[PDB]
Amino acid sequence: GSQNQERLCAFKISHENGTILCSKGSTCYGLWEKSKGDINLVKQGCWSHIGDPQECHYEECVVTTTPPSIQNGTYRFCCCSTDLCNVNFTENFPP
Amino acid sequence: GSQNQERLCAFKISHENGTILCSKGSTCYGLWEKSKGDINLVKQGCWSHIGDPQECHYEECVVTTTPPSIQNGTYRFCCCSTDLCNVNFTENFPP
Amino acid sequence: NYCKRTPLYIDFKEIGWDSWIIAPPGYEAYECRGVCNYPLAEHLTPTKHAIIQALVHLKNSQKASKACCVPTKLEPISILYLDKGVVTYKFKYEGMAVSECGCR
Amino acid sequence: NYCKRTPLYIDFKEIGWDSWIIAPPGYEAYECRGVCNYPLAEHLTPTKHAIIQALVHLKNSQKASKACCVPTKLEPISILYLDKGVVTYKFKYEGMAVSECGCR
């Protein structure tokens, strides 16, 4: 919960049955790669609260930063602060 | 010797039979307390070369700094760089 | 003012490192700003050397410098980066964020 | 110039500490002086944070400070001191002398 700063997140402390516990206020994250209709899940798991990255405060997994130019701008990273929020991702790019 | 930076010093690595080995370029030291005819040996042993204290470069154990004002200026410290040089002490005060 | 931790955000895009760091877009790294005044407070966890040097600087500003306010405890952050085209995840990338400042 | 170790002698009498430190009369404590220039050389053993902050300072002198040249490895010295009238000998009094400088 929020009091003990624990959170359940999807996974591609044990990683049993596609989920993982993220303690110490850690958040869920997911990394995809997308090019037109092709979408592939790369990694899922915990994201440390240390450094308090901005977009990990969203309750949904939204990609709000323009993707890096590497691999033709195909990577899609998002982090979020509700349980199992990294199951899928929504896009909201500046471009 | 000087090549291996080892030195034998008096003692009041084992401290067998009143001597002790001072490695790593360490020097001998002796601390006495003196007030008129009363002289007493307090401690003997090794003095680390780290910090390269000035008066430890003497080959003889000479007290070349004015004693500290504590305990009526009775303490007599000296350090030296020859084997068993801390057996006794000689004085050379500014006062 | 006094040596404390102060905000500092790192934008990997703006520093030119999104070429190899996929995630995050940035993070709070913090920094340490302020003067180290003698006597050095305990929360600044001063070393014995920093205490001595600070004192010498007080007596003679030319013989020694002040103790410097620097990070004394660094914490790790989560990272995703590319290594020869290989995505590499580290839950704890050491030495990235400042949790405590002090005088050294 | 560049961040390096520089001489600094401590005279315990002149700093007023012979009241409790019987020996030595003094010792070479050294200090660290110089600028930390980007890129931070390897012998300065820079942390990841010091590298990032140095880069931000280069891009924007107001957003971040330079990395500071501070002692990164402290060594012990031998000491004789008084504790409530008790002579106390330590072959290794930690944190007293600087063996290596670096950027942090």
Author numbering:
A (entry chain B), B (entry chain B): 26 to 37, 51 to 133
C (entry chain A), D (entry chain A): 321 to 424
Study authors write:
The TGF-β ligands are dimers and initiate signal transduction by forming a signalling complex with two copies of a type I receptor and two copies of a type II receptor; all are single-pass transmembrane proteins containing a small extracellular ligand-binding domain (ECD) and an intracellular kinase domain (ICD). Upon signalling complex formation, the constitutively active type II receptor phosphorylates and activates the type I receptor; subsequently the type I receptor phosphorylates Smad1/5 or Smad2/3 to regulate transcriptional responses. For example, ActRIIA/B bind to and mediate the signalling from both activin ligands and some BMP ligands, whereas BMPRII is the low-affinity type II receptor for over 15 BMP ligands. Of note, BMPRII is particularly highly expressed in lung vascular endothelial cells, where it mediates the signalling from circulating BMP9 and BMP10.
We solved crystal structures of the BMPRII binary complex with BMP10 in two different crystal forms, at 1.48 Å and 2.4 Å, respectively. In the 2.4 Å structure, there is only one copy each of BMP10 and BMPRII monomers in an asymmetric unit. The dimeric receptor complex can be generated with a symmetry-related molecule. Using the chain identities to name the seven complexes, they are complexes AC and BD, complex AB and complexes AI, BJ, CK and DL from the ternary complexes. Interestingly, 5 out of 15 residues with alternate conformations in complex AC are at this area, suggesting that the conformation in this region is highly flexible. Consistent with this observation, in complex BD and complex AB, the F3-loop region makes different interactions with BMP10 but both involve BMP10 residue D338 and are near BMPRII residue S107. Of note, these interactions are present in all three BMP10:BMPRII 1:1 complexes from the binary complexes, but not in those from the ternary complexes. S107 makes an additional interaction with BMP10 in binary complexes, but not in ternary complexes. In contrast, in the free ligand form, or in the complex with ALK1 (but no prodomain), BMP9 and 10 preferentially adopt the extended conformation. ENG-bound BMP9 is closer to the prodomain-bound form, whereas BMPRII-bound BMP10 (in the absence of ALK1) mostly adopts an intermediate conformation.
